[model samples]
Target: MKSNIQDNCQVTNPATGHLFDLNSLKNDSGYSVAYSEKGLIYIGICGGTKNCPSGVGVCFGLTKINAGSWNSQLMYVDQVLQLVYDDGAPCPSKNALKYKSVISFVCTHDSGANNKPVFVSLDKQTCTLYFSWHTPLACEKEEPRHH
Candidate 1:
């Protein structure tokens, strides 16, 4: 269920299982299936950014599974936008080890906004940042970071 950042992999909620490609679930697609150190699943980068957030600023969400399926909900949260520059492209997914993480994301750019995460809902398409942690009691108190 709530696993710390220690383990390597964990089972996903049935809601996701019902929609995702089961055959291809284990494999990394932008690192969406990444597991926490505690062996539990949390939203993780399918990969990383290099030149633009347009395609590299993507992350995936994971949920605990007790049985057949779990439901998904979009709770409000803050997201931080990272800014980086190397005079060249940020870097490729496989080459992310080379670029610096961005702090401020600019939505208007050919390379896109590095690690800038946009606040919104989820879907099959769209490269976005990770949603920061927060409590969902009051809207004004639920601040973490956002673009």
Candidate 2:
């Protein structure tokens, strides 16, 4: 009898359509927790009134690095509903939501001036995305998901 061997493998996002390398997106800040490929795949296939924070602290797949001229809305739930972006555009409260913690968005090449620069940090070892602060302290690091 022959024994069947299966190897544990990590799959990349087909949306990326290319070799997804963490090194490519490696910046001074933390890394972006990817969905659409891992357990968080539900975030894409299932939208609108889904569960709480899809990819809370799981960085399994790759990011849409080709963020062209497009833009994204980082929504969260904090003491006060807040929206954070770099486009300098006056955002209406309609599409905006209460930002609680680290959120991400993708922008296309033809999007608009909304593709502004925002600082982020990612600890590849721990798959943690740190935002809103210059340096993540011990408390921040402890809580993989922070506001």
Candidate 3:
């Protein structure tokens, strides 16, 4: 699903009947959530950073050896947010072996403090990423009234 930023970056989960309006969570330069740990990761909630460069949600950057390569172990992509870069952490999944980063967001109802997202764990074996997002935008659709 394409996230139209001009339209408020709101999207509905195909797997679940949840409505997510993520424009408020696009903190990183008004387009993504960036986190720095062992490395740096950029997550586009409603599609930012060039739509995560080829639909890649989580793009991690670092300077270390992973899978025998120095710099990044994540899936390689032509771009992350900007530039023709290919330095992301290894996020391989079960079905694919070529290295693909898939992020899993866990919604937390945080009606206070901040709307920051937390990085849970990257199941490298599965390479399926996990995170905790605290936002009121994660809600169930009831029905929009139009007069």
Q: CA lDDT of each candidate?
A: 0.23, 0.23, 0.37
What's the TM-score of each model vs. the native? 0.16, 0.18, 0.45
Q: In candidate 3, what are the lDDT values of residues 1-147, reduced to their tens digit?
A: 322213344444443423454444543442233444555455554344442443444555443212111111121111111111123445344533323333333334554222554555555554444454554444333342331
Evaluate model 2: give its TM-score: 0.18
- Displacement of the residue 82 alpha carbon in candidate 1, Å: 19
For candidate 2, the per-residue lDDT at 146 reads 30
Rank by TM-score (best first): 3, 2, 1
lDDT of 2 by residue, 51-101 (tens): 212222122223322111111222212211112222221223233322122
TM-score of 1: 0.16
RMSD score of candidate 2 (Å): 20.1
Error at 78, model 1, angstroms: 15
TM-score between candidate 3 and the true structure: 0.45
